[PDB]
Design a protein around this ligand. Structure first.
Ligand SMILES: O=C(O)CC[C@@H](O)C(=O)O
Ligand SMILES: [Mn+2]
Length: 228
């Protein structure tokens, strides 16, 4: 089934129908006119951030390079491998970029402090994949550039997703969502899910502990807000 799209729902409607029961939704008309949506070209990113060091996931290895090197090696030049500037607090590192985003007003429905909201950048070429995993906070995933295919499985379905047994990976499924090994993981086939293609200006609410799998369909930039 599809994730529902709602235009600027009230705080109360969002709280009652989505946050408290733990149901995903796409919020429209919320982030669509943030400055990032028109300002963040590759060239702008190079101008503001190009000389700064970022962590880059390659493949599986973790390396460090400048933003300029990342763009040259993994985005613009026929790249040899997939590289992803994933899960990085770029906005703490480069505070000028905070001017181009906002914290969604819905985060004020949580029990946590605004100071403790973690804002991560996710910037990479077409074809980056984040395997199916769950996170311990609520998330608003804001799509700025490009589109992502997203699959969502409820925490009720965790038995059918065969989480890894190691503590480093217990929040991650052993299954490759788009090419599952049903001989090894047969319960996966019948597990229900939601999916969407998340486009620029749209926000995906991923409830706490909802399993999510993400594949970039174009050159992509997303901003996540982890909150409670
Ligand atoms: O966009 C991605 O590739 C994954 C993002 C996601 O896991 C998150 O927690 O925001
Ligand atoms: Mn995540």
């Amino acid at each position: 089934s599809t994730v529902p799209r709602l235009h600027r729902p009230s705080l109360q409607h969002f709280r009652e129908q989505f946050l408290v029961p733990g149901r995903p939704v796409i919020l429209k008309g919320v982030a669509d006119h943030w400055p990032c949506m028109q300002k963040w070209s590759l060239e702008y990113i190079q101008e503001i951030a190009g000389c700064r060091t970022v962590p880059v996931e390659v493949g599986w290895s973790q390396t460090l390079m400048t933003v300029n090197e990342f763009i040259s090696k993994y985005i613009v030049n026929e790249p040899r491998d997939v590289g992803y500037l994933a899960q990085h607090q770029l906005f703490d590192q480069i505070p000028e970029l905070k001017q181009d985003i906002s914290i969604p007003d819905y985060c004020s429905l949580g029990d946590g402090e605004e100071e403790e909201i973690t804002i991560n950048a996710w910037f990479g070429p077409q074809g980056t994949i984040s395997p199916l995993h769950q996170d311990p906070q609520q998330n608003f995933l804001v799509q700025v550039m490009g589109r992502k295919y997203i699959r969502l499985y409820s925490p009720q379905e965790s038995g059918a997703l065969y989480p890894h047994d190691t503590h480093l990976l217990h929040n991650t499924s052993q299954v490759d969502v788009e090419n599952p090994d049903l001989e090894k993981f047969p319960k996966f086939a019948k597990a229900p899910f939601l999916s969407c293609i998340l486009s620029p200006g749209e926000i995906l609410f991923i409830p706490v502990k909802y399993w999510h799998y993400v594949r970039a369909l174009d050159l992509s930039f997303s901003v996540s807000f982890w909150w409670s």
